[PDB]
């Protein structure tokens, strides 16, 4: 046998047994009869589809929005580039004697610290930030925690 | 030849022999249901077959406008109206005998005078 | 509403507070299966209706062999008031009606 | 209307008149092999052999047609339920991603969306597919029994003339598909490359 | 030929709904052994059901086409011998007046 | 049927070897003794909500099984006449009550004649022999292989 089958329980109940099958058909002797026939006839005489609409405006005016037009697009849909541009900021060099102290506190919080997160937390240029980061920490590329900066064993083993 | 079907699962039965009574039994191959055969015939392969000579005869055959008419006498109701057609078997060995269908009694007779 | 399968651990006792067995109590109830025309079905299958009002009356001859249902005057004189119930199968066999409800999920 | 692709279904009567066993096998798209008709019927939800013949032959006394159907049921006897019939179809399918359990679902989808598409492609229409399949088998047996001549390919009633309308419709359908594909490719490029 | 014309095709669904309302039994409840005289109804090569009195259906269908309710291009064939009723609505069929 | 009967949705995989409701009770009784990154860009094809909802609900078809496993029926959804039916229930006063229909399910019996398995089914049809024996099922039944759930449950229950 198989241990697991993944059933889906539901509350069910038999609430009757069918005894007769019926086909309701309007009586041909009813005074209102032949109105259904007209309704049935109208079913085949109805065309839901609508014909294409042809523009009656001047061709030159219609094409004014096509091609190398002078109009500046006002659409904001899927403007990925615009969104990123607005959010921009840069700090200035935030001298050494303070940053070198801050990293160790950041390292103490967690022993494996990413580059992207570190730039987010420290807000430094990557250029200057690399100098201090390499002086204090090292990166293990070939290990399971690849591309992750970690404090050097000399300072971690304290 | 008549095909038989099982009662418990609707599967078709197959012949079997019972040496205890030397009889013919039709037994199902899945649910072990048996039933004595009413006839000893189990197979037939008619190399020359006449099945399909009048295939397609319906209650409203006379309503077909493409069928030809004839004035031959119906030897079951004595009527002159009828629609006739050739054999419906497409094997290129059948005779050109005509089959007549009466429009008053739905009786089918043939013009054959050799064997009938 | 996913749930365990064989449930050899007996988890249904607390997960659900209702019996999980099919209720074969109301099965002994005569039911007629009726196929309706498009015009009549379009107004009898609406869920914004069926307030328990009178939809008509079923008329059966004393000797049988002929049935007919007559609607009330609520149709607005737009459809026939008399219909013939054609029994496509006098003896209907092995057809049943079963419901479906959600189970209480706590305790 | 809807996809404009064409799928061909062939029901083939193997063996000659001098053979002791002539079976019928049908070719299904994306299956790579010819399957006996009985197995296909079971895959559609018709397990009983009697029900299988009922869809094929519409006459009880037409024993001659039933006799020719005897080998077909004999070949497809080792399969006697829907689940195993679907798995047999699935194993022959050329996907090789389905491992052992998606095979049943994969086979079910093929029989639903790619098998006889001109009837329907929505779930819950296995009965219609089976009845048409029996109709195809019934027609094949009728010709095989010298009761109906093979269909004439020169019959003008079975031919269609494609005018500028249908010809342009297919061209526009193909070109529009390319345009739609190009549009999305721009969206993917625009989203990933951070472009307006 | 001079009088030859080629159809443009129309929607077959209106014809299918008409057949259902006039006694075209759905194929889901078709038992061949309980009715070995029914006529198979085909619309654009699709078997949609069976119908017990093919004469009345054909007369009603022909009358509707002639007066104009059904598009004249729709082709209707009743094979009495084969017990089949075929209705064609697709485009590309060649027809001529008579 | 052997009461009680359960009608729920379950996956139709290895139904032949599935445990019978009575057996789980027997096994449950045994328990008492023991105690004491992505591509970041993908295309989704628009699909009508009705079909997707129908597909999700109908993934696991209805299965009706009795206590002893003597009856096992699997329901298949039907769409031809699902929404064109109306039910009239006869109350115990002579009157009739109308209830619209929702769906139609066709139930087919499962595991009544010791169905084989796919692995063995392919082997037999393959060129293992000229043709499968006419009474192969009878021969294998005596060997004991290829049993049924009802036969599977009775022996285990009797063994206790
Ligand atoms: Zn049997
Ligand atoms: Zn006569």
Tokens of B48: 């020359």
Angle at A19 between CA F63 and CA C36, to 5 degrees: 95
How far is the first Cα of chain F from the last one, in angstroms, to the nearest whole number?
23
- D46 domain-assigned: yes
Q: Are residues B107 and B55 in the same domain?
A: yes
Structural domain that includes position D126: 1-160
The answer, for D118 touching chain E at a CB cutoff of 8 Å, is: yes
Within 10 A of F116 (CB to CB), how many other CB atoms are there?
22
Q: Enter the resolution in angstroms.
A: 3.2
Determination technique used: cryo-EM
Q: Are residues B39 and B29 in the same domain?
A: yes
Q: Are residues B33 and B57 in the same domain?
A: no
Structural domain that includes position B99: 46-116
Q: Are residues B9 and B37 in the same domain?
A: yes
| Cross-chain Cβ contact C6/A24 below 8 Å | no
Q: Are residues B101 and B57 in the same domain?
A: yes
CATH of the domain at D108: 3.90.1110.10
Tokens of D57: 């032959």
How far is the first Cα of chain C from the last one, in angstroms, to the nearest whole number?
15
Name the residue of chain E whose CA is nearest to D56's CA.
Answer: E32
Residues 6+ apart with CB under 8 A from B59: B106, E37
- Name the domain count of chain D: 1
What is the nearest CA distance from E92 to chain F, expressed in angstroms?
A: 30
Q: Are residues B51 and B87 in the same domain?
A: yes
Q: Are residues B52 and B109 in the same domain?
A: yes
Q: Are residues B60 and B116 in the same domain?
A: yes
Q: Are residues B53 and B9 in the same domain?
A: no
Tell which phi-psi region holds residue D45, choosing left (phi > 0), alpha (psi between -120 and 50) or beta. left
CA pair distance F82, D124, nearest whole angstrom: 10
Tell me which chain D residues have a C-beta less than 8 angstroms from the C-beta of A80.
190-191, 194-196
Tokens of F135: 């009474």
Strands E84-88 and E39-43 come out as parallel
Helix, strand, or coil (residue B6):
coil
Question: Which residues are close to ligand 2, an ion, with C-beta < 5 A?
Answer: B 74, 77, 79, 102, 104-105, 107
- Name the domain count of chain B: 2
Residues 6+ apart with CB under 8 A from C21: F4, F5, F6
Determine which of C4, C44, C82 to mutate to test the interface with A (most A C-beta atoms within 10 Å): C82
Q: Are residues B56 and B97 in the same domain?
A: yes
Tell me which chain F residues have a C-beta less than 8 angstroms from the C-beta of D191.
41
Helix, strand, or coil (residue A156):
helix
| Cross-chain Cβ contact B60/E55 below 8 Å | yes
- Binding-site residues of B sit at 6, 9, 28, 31, 74, 77, 102, 105
Helix, strand, or coil (residue F49):
helix
Q: What is the DSSP letter of A53?
A: P
Segment holding B30, helix H or strand E: none
Q: Are residues B60 and B109 in the same domain?
A: yes
Tell me which chain B residues have a C-beta less than 8 angstroms from the C-beta of F135.
16, 27, 29
Chains F and E touch (3+ CB pairs under 8 A): yes
CA distances from F99 to C83, C85, C97, F102 (A): 19, 17, 11, 9
The answer, for F87 touching chain C at a CB cutoff of 8 Å, is: yes
Tokens of C25: 């109590």
- D175 domain-assigned: no
Cα F70 versus chain centre, distance: 12
Q: Nearest bound ligand to CA B62? A: 2
Tell me which chain B residues have a C-beta less than 8 angstroms from the C-beta of D53.
12
């Amino acid at each position: 046998y198989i241990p697991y089958v993944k059933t889906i329980p539901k509350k069910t109940a038999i609430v009757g047994t069918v005894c007769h099958e019926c086909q309701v058909m309007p009586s041909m002797n009813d005074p209102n009869y032949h109105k259904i026939v007209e309704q049935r006839r109208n079913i085949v005489k109805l065309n839901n589809k609508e014909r294409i609409t042809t523009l009656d405006e001047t061709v030159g005016v219609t094409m004014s929005h096509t091609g190398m037009s002078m109009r500046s697009d006002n659409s904001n849909f899927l403007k990925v580039g615009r969104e990123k541009a607005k959010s921009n900021i840069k700090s200035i060099r935030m001298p050494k004697k303070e940053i070198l102290d801050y990293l160790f506190k950041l390292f103490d919080e967690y022993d494996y610290w990413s580059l992207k997160g570190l730039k987010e937390r420290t807000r430094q240029p990557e250029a200057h930030l690399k100098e201090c980061l390499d002086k204090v920490a090292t990166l293990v590329k070939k290990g399971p925690y690849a591309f992750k900066y970690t404090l050097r064993p000399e300072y971690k083993k304290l | 030849t008549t095909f038989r079907f099982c009662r418990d699962c609707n599967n078709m039965l197959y012949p079997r022999e019972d040496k205890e009574n030397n009889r013919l039994l039709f037994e199902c191959r899945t649910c072990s249901y048996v039933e004595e055969a009413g006839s000893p015939l189990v197979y037939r392969h008619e190399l020359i077959t006449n099945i399909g000579e009048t295939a397609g005869v319906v209650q409203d055959i006379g309503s077909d406008p493409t069928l030809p008419r004839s004035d031959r006498e119906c030897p079951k109701c004595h009527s002159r109206e009828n629609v006739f057609f050739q054999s419906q078997q497409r094997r290129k060995d059948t005779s050109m005998v005509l089959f007549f269908v009466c429009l008053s009694c739905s009786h089918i007779f043939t013009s054959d005078q050799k064997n009938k | 509403e996913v749930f365990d399968g064989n449930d050899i651990e007996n988890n249904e006792t607390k997960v659900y507070e209702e019996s999980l067995d099919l209720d074969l109590e109301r099965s002994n109830r005569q039911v007629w299966l009726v196929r309706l025309p498009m015009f009549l079905a379009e107004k009898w299958r609406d869920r914004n209706n069926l307030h328990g009002q009178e939809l008509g009356k079923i008329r059966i001859n004393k000797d049988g062999s002929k049935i007919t249902l007559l609607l009330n005057e609520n149709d607005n004189d737009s459809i026939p008031h008399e219909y013939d119930l054609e029994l496509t199968k006098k003896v209907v066999e092995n057809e049943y009606v079963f419901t479906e409800q959600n189970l209480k999920k706590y305790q | 209307k809807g996809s404009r692709f064409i799928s061909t279904l062939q029901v083939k009567l193997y063996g000659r008149e001098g053979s002791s066993a002539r079976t019928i096998k049908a070719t299904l798209p994306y299956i790579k092999q010819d399957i006996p008709i009985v197995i296909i019927f079971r895959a559609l939800g018709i397990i009983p052999d009697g029900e299988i013949l009922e869809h094929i032959c519409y006459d009880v006394n037409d024993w001659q047609m039933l006799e020719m159907l005897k080998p077909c049921v004999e070949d497809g006897f080792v399969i006697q339920d829907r689940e195993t019939a679907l798995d047999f179809i699935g194993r022959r399918g050329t996907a090789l991603g389905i491992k052992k359990e998606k095979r049943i679902q994969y086979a079910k989808d093929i029989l639903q969306k790619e098998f006889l598409p001109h009837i329907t492609q929505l779930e819950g229409f296995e009965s219609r597919k089976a009845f048409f399949l029996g109709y195809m088998i019934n027609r094949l047996l009728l010709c095989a029994l010298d009761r109906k001549d093979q269909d004439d390919r020169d019959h003008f009633g079975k031919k269609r003339l494609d005018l500028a309308g249908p010809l342009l419709a297919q061209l526009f359908k193909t070109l529009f598909k390319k345009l739609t594909k190009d549009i999305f490719r721009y969206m993917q490029r625009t989203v990933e490359e951070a472009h307006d | 030929s001079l009088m030859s014309c080629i159809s443009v095709g129309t929607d077959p669904m209106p014809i299918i709904t008409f057949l259902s309302e006039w006694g075209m039994e759905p194929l889901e409840d078709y038992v061949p052994h309980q009715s070995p005289d029914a006529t198979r109804v085909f619309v654009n090569g699709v078997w949609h059901g069976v119908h017990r009195n093919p004469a009345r259906l054909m007369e009603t269908l022909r009358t509707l086409r002639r007066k104009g309710d059904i598009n004249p291009e729709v082709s209707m064939i009743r094979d009495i011998r084969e017990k089949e009723l075929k209705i064609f609505t697709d485009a590309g069929r060649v027809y001529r007046p008579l | 049927f052997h009461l009680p009967v359960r009608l729920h949705r379950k996956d139709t995989r290895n139904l032949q070897f599935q445990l019978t409701r009575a057996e789980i009770v027997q096994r449950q009784k045994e328990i008492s003794e023991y105690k004491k990154l992505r591509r970041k860009t993908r295309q989704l094809k628009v699909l009508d909500e009705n079909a997707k909802k129908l597909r999700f609900e109908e993934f696991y078809p209805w299965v009706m099984e009795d206590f002893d496993g003597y009856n096992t029926w699997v329901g298949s959804y039907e769409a031809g006449n699902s929404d064109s039916y109306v039910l009239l229930s006869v109350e115990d006063d002579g009157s009739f009550t109308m209830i619209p229909a929702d769906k139609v399910y066709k139930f087919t019996a499962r595991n009544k004649y010791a169905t084989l398995t796919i692995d063995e089914a392919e082997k037999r049809m393959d060129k293992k022999s000229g043709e499968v024996p006419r009474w192969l099922m009878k021969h294998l039944d005596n060997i004991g292989t290829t049993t049924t759930r009802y036969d599977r449950t009775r022996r285990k229950l009797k063994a206790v």
